[PDB]
C-alpha positions as a printed Julia matrix, in Angstrom:
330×3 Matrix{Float64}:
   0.0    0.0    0.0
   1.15   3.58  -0.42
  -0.46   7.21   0.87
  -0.34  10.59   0.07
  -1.55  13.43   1.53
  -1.0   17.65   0.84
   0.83  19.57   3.46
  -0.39  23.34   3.67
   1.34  26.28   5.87
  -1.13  27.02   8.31
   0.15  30.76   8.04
   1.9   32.88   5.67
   5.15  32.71   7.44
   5.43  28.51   7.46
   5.06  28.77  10.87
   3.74  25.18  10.66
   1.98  22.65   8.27
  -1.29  20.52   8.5
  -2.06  17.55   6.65
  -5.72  16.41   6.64
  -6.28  12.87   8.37
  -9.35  10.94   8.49
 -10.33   9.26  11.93
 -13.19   6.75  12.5
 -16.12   5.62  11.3
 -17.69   7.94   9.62
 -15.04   9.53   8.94
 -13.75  12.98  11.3
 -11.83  14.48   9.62
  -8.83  16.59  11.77
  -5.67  18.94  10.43
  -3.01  17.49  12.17
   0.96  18.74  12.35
   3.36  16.29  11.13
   5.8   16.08  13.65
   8.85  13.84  13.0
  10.46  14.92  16.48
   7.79  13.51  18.42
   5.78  10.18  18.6
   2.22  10.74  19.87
  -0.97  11.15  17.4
  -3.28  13.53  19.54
  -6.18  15.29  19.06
  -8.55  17.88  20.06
 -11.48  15.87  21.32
 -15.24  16.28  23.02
 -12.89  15.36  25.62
 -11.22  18.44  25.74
 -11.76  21.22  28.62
 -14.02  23.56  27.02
 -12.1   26.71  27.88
  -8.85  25.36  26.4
 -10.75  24.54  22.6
 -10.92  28.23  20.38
 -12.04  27.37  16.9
 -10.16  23.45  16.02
 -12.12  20.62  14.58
 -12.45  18.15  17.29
 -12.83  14.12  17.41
 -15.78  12.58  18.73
 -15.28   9.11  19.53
 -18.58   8.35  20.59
 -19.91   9.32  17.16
 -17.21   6.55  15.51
 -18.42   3.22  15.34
 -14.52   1.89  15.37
 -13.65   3.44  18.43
 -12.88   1.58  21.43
 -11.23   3.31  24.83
  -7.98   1.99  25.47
  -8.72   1.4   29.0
  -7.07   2.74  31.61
  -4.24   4.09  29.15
  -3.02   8.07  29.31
  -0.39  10.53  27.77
   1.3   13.24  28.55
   3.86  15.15  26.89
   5.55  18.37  26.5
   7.37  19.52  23.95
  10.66  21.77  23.39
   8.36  25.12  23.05
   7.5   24.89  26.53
   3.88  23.75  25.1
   2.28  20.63  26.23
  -1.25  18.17  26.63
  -2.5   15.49  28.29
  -5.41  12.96  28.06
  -7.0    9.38  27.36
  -6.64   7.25  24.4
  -9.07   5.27  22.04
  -8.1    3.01  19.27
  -9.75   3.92  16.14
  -9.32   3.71  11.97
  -6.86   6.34  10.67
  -6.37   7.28   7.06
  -3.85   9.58   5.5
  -3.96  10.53   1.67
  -5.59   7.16   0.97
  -3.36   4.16   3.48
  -5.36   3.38   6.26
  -4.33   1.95   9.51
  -6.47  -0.25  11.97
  -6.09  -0.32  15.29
  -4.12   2.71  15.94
  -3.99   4.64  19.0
  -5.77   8.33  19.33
  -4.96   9.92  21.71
  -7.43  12.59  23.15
  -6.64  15.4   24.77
  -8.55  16.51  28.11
  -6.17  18.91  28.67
  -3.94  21.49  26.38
  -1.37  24.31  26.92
  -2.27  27.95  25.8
  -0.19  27.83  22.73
  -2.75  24.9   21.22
  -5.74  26.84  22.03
  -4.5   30.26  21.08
  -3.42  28.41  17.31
  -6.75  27.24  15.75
  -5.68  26.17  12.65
  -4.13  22.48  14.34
  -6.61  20.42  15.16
  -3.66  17.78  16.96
  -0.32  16.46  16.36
   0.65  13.0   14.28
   3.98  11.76  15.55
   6.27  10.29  13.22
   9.55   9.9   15.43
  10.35   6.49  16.81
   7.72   4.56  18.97
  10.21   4.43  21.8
   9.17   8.26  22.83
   5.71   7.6   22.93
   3.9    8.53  26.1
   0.68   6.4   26.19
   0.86   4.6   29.79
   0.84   1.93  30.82
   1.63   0.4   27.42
   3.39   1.94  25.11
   1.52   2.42  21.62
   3.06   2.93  18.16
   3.18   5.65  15.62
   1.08   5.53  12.8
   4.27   5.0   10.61
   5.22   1.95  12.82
   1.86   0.49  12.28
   1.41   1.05   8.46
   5.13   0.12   7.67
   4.89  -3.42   6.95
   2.11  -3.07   4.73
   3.81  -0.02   2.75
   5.14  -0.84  -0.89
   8.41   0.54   0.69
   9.03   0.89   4.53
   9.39   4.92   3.64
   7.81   8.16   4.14
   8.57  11.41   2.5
   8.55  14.87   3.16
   8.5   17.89   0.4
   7.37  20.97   2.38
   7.05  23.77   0.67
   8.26  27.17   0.81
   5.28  29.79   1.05
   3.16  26.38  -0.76
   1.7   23.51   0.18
   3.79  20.27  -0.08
   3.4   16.5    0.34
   3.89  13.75   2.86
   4.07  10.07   0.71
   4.12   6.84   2.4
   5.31   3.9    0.95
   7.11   5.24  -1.91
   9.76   7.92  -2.92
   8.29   9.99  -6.14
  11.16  10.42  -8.52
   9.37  13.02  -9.84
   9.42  15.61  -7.03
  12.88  16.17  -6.72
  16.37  16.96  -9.04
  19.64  15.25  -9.26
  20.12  11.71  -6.61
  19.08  11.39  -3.08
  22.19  11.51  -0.63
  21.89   8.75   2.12
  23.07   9.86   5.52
  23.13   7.18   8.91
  20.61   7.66  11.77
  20.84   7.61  15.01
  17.68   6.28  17.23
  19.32   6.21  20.86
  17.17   9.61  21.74
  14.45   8.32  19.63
  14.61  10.53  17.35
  15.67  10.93  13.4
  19.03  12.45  14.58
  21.99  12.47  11.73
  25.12  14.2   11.27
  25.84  17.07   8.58
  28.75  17.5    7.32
  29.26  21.45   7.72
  28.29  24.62   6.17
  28.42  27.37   4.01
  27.33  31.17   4.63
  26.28  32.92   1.64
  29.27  32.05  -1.61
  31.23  31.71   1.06
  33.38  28.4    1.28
  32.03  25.32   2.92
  33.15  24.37   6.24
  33.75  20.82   6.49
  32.06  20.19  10.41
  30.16  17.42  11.78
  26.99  18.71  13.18
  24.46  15.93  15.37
  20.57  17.49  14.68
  17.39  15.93  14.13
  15.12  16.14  10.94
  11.69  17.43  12.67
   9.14  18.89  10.59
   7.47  19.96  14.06
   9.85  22.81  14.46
   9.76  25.84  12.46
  13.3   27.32  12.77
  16.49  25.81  12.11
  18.75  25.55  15.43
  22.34  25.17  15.2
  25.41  25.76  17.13
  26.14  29.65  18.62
  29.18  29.55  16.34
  27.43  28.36  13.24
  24.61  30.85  13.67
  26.96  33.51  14.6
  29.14  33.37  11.4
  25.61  33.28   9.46
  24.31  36.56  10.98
  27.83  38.11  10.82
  27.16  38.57   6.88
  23.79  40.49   7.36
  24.43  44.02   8.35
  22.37  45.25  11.7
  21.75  41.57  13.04
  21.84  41.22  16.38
  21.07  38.41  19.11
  18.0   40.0   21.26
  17.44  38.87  24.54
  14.22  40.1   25.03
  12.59  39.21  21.58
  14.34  35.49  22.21
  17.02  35.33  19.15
  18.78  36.81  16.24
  16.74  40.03  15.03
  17.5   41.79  11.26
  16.61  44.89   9.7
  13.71  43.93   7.71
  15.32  46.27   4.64
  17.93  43.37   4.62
  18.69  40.85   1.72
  19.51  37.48   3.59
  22.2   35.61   2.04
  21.89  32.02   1.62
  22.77  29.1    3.78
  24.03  25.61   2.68
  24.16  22.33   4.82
  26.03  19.37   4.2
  24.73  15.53   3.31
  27.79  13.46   3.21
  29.61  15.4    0.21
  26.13  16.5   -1.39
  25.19  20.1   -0.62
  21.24  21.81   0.82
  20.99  25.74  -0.18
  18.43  27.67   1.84
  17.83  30.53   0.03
  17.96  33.89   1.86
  14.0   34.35   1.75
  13.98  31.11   3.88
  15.09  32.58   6.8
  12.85  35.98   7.15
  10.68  35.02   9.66
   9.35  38.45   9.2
   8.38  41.6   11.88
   8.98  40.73  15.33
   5.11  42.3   15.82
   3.17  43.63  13.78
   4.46  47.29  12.1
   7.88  46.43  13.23
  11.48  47.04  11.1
  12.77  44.57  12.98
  12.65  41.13  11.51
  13.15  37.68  13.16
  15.52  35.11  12.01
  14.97  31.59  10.47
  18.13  30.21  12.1
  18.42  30.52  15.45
  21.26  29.07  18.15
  20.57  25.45  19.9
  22.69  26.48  22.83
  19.77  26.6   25.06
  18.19  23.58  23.82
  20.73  20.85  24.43
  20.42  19.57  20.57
  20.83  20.76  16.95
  17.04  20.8   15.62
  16.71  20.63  11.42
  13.37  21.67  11.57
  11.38  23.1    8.13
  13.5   25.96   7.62
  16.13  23.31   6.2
  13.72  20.53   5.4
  11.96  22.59   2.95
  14.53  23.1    1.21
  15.18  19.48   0.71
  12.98  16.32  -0.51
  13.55  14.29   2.53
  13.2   10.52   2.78
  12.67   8.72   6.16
  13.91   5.22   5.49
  12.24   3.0    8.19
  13.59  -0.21   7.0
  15.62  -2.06   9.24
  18.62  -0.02  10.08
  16.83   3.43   9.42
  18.58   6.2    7.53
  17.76   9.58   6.33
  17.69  10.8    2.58
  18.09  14.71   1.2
  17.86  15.78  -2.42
  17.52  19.3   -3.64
  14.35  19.78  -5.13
């Protein structure tokens, strides 16, 4: 079997994408973010604290003849934004772009942090990092990835976000079509449970490349890209008036600037970000100052490729045996 699904920016800065998903019988369906640095599939629900729900699309499981309550299972989670939710879980039928999964754990919220309610275009979060960080208690569950892969064509999915566009998500098969040149193979590590690679180093601009190995994750759930202080440092160096803000949270630009480009390595192939990538636009609204696409990881604890650089990339997660990652230029 194969899916395939279109990915649209729920904003017109890419702050995130949703990808419609159909859940039980009939079928709900919800807008869910992608998120290949995480490992829970939740929802807004009837569940949910009325307060804490502001305009999503919510999952009612007693309207879906499939759904069955995973008893006495819960979740909890919390992410790197400082957001986070909580709830119960039912089993249900999920569907994305056409494959269709049995069985698979939804997990509803009862409980979500500001940031959730305050953003009504995501309707709940489809985790696509490895099973191991899954928070359903007291049994683990698995990702919808994990449960589809056996039946896919190919034990694959794809992502092709798109720059100010919508893009795709394909399971089960790589579309030679929607990218140039060869895919570049790169190892993954899962020990943090995550899709975490190396790069190979940088380039600033037409500067020359740096040859550097740099440990990050490919996770489509983060909007910025998050490197080392040095790396980000010699970026903003080459755009006149940048500055690292304390009180907005980051690297700041004059919003007259022209951003130069910046490259990451994939064994010897190459990823250019164009400059336009990485305007992240007025810090509020009216503003000349702009906020920046790449942004330091010292404060995080690791490197984070999040769609900044993925979109820039068609990017293969290879969930065969010994799982790898994939990057062509597109």
């Amino acid at each position: 079997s194969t899916g395939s699904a279109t990915t649209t920016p729920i904003d017109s800065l890419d702050d995130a994408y949703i990808t419609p998903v159909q859940i039980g019988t009939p079928a709900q369906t919800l807008n869910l973010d992608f998120d290949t640095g995480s490992s829970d599939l939740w929802v807004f629900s009837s569940e949910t604290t009325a307060s804490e729900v502001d305009g999503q699309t919510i999952y009612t499981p007693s309207k879906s003849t499939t759904a069955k309550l995973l008893s006495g299972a819960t979740w909890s989670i919390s992410y790197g934004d400082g957001s986070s939710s909580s709830g119960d879980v039912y089993t249900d039928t999920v569907s994305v772009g056409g494959l269709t999964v049995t069985g698979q754990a939804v997990e509803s919220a009862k409980k979500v942090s500001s940031s959730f309610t305050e953003d009504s275009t995501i309707d709940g979060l489809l985790g696509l990092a490895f099973s191991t960080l899954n928070t359903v208690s007291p049994t683990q569950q698995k990702t919808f990835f994990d449960n589809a892969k056996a039946s896919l064509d190919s034990p694959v999915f794809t992502a092709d976000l798109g720059y100010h566009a919508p893009g795709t998500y394909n399971f089960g098969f790589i579309d030679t079509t929607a990218y140039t040149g060869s895919i570049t193979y790169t190892a993954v590590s899962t020990k943090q449970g995550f899709w975490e690679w190396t790069s190979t180093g940088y380039a600033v601009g037409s500067g020359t490349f740096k040859s550097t190995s740099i440990d990050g994750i490919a996770d489509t759930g983060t909007t910025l890209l998050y490197l080392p202080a040095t790396v980000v440092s010699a970026y903003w160096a080459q755009v006149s008036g940048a500055k690292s803000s304390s009180s907005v949270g980051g690297y700041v630009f004059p919003c007259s600037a022209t951003l130069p480009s910046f490259t990451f390595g994939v064994g010897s192939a190459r990823i250019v970000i164009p400059g336009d990538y990485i305007d992240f636009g007025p810090i509020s609204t009216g503003s000349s100052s702009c906020f920046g696409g790449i942004q330091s990881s010292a404060g995080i604890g690791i490197n984070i490729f999040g769609d900044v650089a993925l979109k820039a990339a068609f990017v293969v997660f290879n969930g065969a045996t010994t799982p790898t990652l994939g990057f062509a230029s597109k």
